Symmetry: C2
Subunit: 125 residues, 2 copies
Amino acid sequence: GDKPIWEQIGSSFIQHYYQLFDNDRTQLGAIYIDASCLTWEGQQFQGKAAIVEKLSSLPFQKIQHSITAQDHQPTPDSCIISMVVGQLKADEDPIMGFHQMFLLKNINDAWVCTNDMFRLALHNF
Amino acid sequence: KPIWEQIGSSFIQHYYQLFDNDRTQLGAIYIDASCLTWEGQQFQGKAAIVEKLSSLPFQKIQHSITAQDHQPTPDSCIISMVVGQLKADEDPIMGFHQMFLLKNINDAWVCTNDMFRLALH
């Protein structure tokens, strides 16, 4: 009928997440649940509480993301899985590349994030 | 190391070993209803997947993993995320991103979802 639902939901989710991320990361708790997991630069965080503290604690003042590419697929358990590739610009730091992954689940008529993995692309020096 | 990391690590080892050696044998780690997104293009089902992979235009390929992250999901699956480099034949080294969703079926771990993307300079 045109665009599959996972494409629609994934895309809108991604957009909403970065907007929140780029304007007020303290509001990020809304997209996670207690059983959510976050791996940020190789470090794992379990649970909404620990996740939000971590993200709230980043030393950036101004952050801006840019998506180069996003891919979405439905999973067998009816979840939505997405892979994002893009660039980040924080404060006066140099532009960095990153990759992000999200696993979405519909809970209570709502799509929430149960798994989030983020890793920066390092410059080969 | 946590259980999920042990499984993820092995799977990837398995995957790239096959990829780099006998890619026509990759079917072994997929299921009939597997899904592959390769550079933005979708390949649905084992048969489509295998053809696609077997058909890549190079003869020799080699991968190297720069970083690998693994997580367990609430529904018993495992998500494996990798960043790396590869060299195919005589082409220059290219950066890449790959992600896998692993499921335990019939007592073994298989890949149900696979997403691959080359990095841009």
